[PDB]
């Protein structure tokens, strides 16, 4: 019948890492980079966990990716 469709606008932003947790790329990097600090530009260059609110929001908005909790 009707399969659920994977939301592509968040599948390109979120990712599972083996143990089963959503990670994400930090924002504020491809715009006005001289104005910032190198401390900021490698603070905003790493991928981190998403917090539990929007870890449980998009877990049902992106169904086919095997995330526990």
């Amino acid at each position: 019948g009707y399969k659920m469709k994977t939301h592509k606008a968040s599948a390109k932003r979120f990712r599972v890492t083996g143990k089963g947790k959503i990670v994400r790329r930090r924002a504020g990097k491809q715009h006005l980079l001289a104005k910032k600090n190198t401390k900021r530009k490698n603070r905003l260059s790493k991928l981190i966990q998403v917090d539990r609110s929007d870890y449980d929001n998009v877990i049902g908005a992106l169904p086919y990716l095997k995330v526990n909790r």
Partner: protein, 177 residues
């Protein structure tokens, strides 16, 4: 067991709660949806992932890198098999190890790609019992384990790429010792 005396265990089948059948039932009246709003009205309601007019969670985050470029994603090109899959197996001292051996034994069950990704033997775990492996290429540590066990190790060349005769000529010119 007769047709009479059969009955399910408790907890196996709960009753589906019916809504709007009385306030003593639990979800009477507004059927458990408060008073008003989009959560009480009938229809599709709210898109999941929508922040109420705020720019959402997914739009404020930049796209993942190769998925931003549209580059083809990282994809497994072999079957990763450790030596822990080989010791716990019932392979005895005289036994061949190949694709159909690991399929027919009960270690790998490959279905989606029987055609593309052959095999690879990795390093974690030991292998005390010697064998005769004719499978695809190895890691350096797994070559150290299998050559440390004194077993017959054989790499298998899978496919031959098509090299153009001027590229094969330019590469055959490079044989200058």
């Amino acid at each position: 067991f007769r047709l009479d005396n059969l009955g399910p265990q408790p907890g196996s089948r709960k009753k589906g709660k019916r809504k709007g059948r009385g306030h003593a039932a639990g979800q009477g009246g507004s059927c458990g949806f408060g008073m008003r709003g989009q959560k009480s009205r009938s229809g599709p309601g709210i898109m999941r992932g929508f922040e109420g007019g705020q720019m959402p969670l997914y739009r404020r985050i930049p796209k993942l890198r190769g998925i931003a470029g549209g580059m083809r994603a990282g994809l497994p090109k072999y079957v990763p098999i450790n030596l822990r899959d080989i010791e716990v197996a019932g392979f005895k001292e005289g036994e061949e190890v190949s694709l159909e051996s690991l399929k027919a034994k009960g270690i790998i069950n490959p279905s989606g790609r029987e055609r593309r990704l052959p095999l690879k033997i990795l390093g974690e775990g030991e292998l005390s019992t010697k064998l005769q492996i004719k499978a695809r290429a190895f890691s350096g540590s797994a070559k150290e384990k299998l050559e440390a066990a004194g077993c017959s190790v054989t790499v298998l060349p899978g496919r031959k790429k098509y090299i153009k005769e001027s590229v094969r000529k330019n590469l055959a010119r490079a044989d200058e010792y």
